[PDB]
Amino acid sequence: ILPDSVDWREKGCVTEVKYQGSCGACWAFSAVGALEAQLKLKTGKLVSLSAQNLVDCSTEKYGNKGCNGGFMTTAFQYIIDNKGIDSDASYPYKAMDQKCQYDSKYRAATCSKYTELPYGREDVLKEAVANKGPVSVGVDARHPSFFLYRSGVYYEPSCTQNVNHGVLVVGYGDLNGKEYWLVKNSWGHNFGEEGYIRMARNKGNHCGIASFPSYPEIHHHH
Amino acid sequence: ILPDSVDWREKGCVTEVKYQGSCGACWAFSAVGALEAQLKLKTGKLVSLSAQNLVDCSTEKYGNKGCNGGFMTTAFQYIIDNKGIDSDASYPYKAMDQKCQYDSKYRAATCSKYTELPYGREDVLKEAVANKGPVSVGVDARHPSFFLYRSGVYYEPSCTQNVNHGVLVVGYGDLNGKEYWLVKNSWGHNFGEEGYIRMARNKGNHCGIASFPSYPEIHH
């Protein structure tokens, strides 16, 4: 039976909010945020993983376009196929397309698989957020109400299920009975509530938050 | 000689900042803001003009796509061709595509002509803002730095001269040695400084602000 509220920040499973600047790397930040939590759960160590490693290395054979966008699922697939991802410390974020510079010497995490949740199932997304960890999702972020959000529970009647922005669901709850998803963005600590947005939950897959969810798992490190 | 600083809000030539919502009508808000200023300068009365009238009626013939974007200059051409535009009060903004509902009986303004300024010429834009009125421009707004802007003079190293968002230049000045354009947006009061942004001026056509400037005129 699921908790009424979850916040993976309280379990030490969520790194500081990142700023993607003028590079469309939301998909890469979403993916490494999902994997960071799995690394903490497995090892007890919270380590920022390299979004830049994904931008530079999870490219055309993964359907991804670096600063012009990508899939969280095919990011996880790169990490599986590459047998690792570098720490952010070793392979820092530059907000631009670079040649691949992955070095196994600075590998900080691996990925053995990823799980894709069923389209528009907010009940199933709630289970995965409670029991597995933070979940990579897409939202429709193409609304001034979204990018000028300051606080409270975001609800936008003009929102669609056509997602265009990769974000991380790190919990859920309710604010005076308005249910929400707790979403970590990569627009820096000045966006929203110190980089987070609470987005309407159980309002018909609002902004497509449950449209294409996925989460990675870790098997071996050595 | 041109003034050091200009602000057309000081002459009562600028309406309230509007909120376009989820409809890409920035081109329409920019076009009516530039015409609103000429209407005040002509009649002495400040009247908000119908961005919706443009979205609905300045369509295929003007290369405009309503909530999917358009051009301030072809909007001015619609007003010239149509022999008017309704007030915002008579033809309210709905943030969606609708059938043309223009009615000459609620006409609040006309347009006799529009002028397009030369590409990249911040000196010529300054002359127009000083001597003519607010100028419709496009900027490159596709930068988190732009939509997160809170105060000061916006400078983005990643900005390009490929413009995508219509806005209105209502002045210029110098804040702490940073030259700026004073820009009215259509993202409501929670964007920037109560709906305005100061954008870097004389920094090589920053964010394309002087790429495609235009202003309308009224004769009667």
Ligand SMILES: Nc1nc2cc(C(F)(F)F)ccc2n1Cc1ccco1
């Ligand atoms: N002339 C002109 N006005 C423009 C307005 C916009 C804006 F998005 F801000 F509304 C973007 C481009 C614009 N151009 C250039 C052009 C020349 C042929 C096609 O487009």
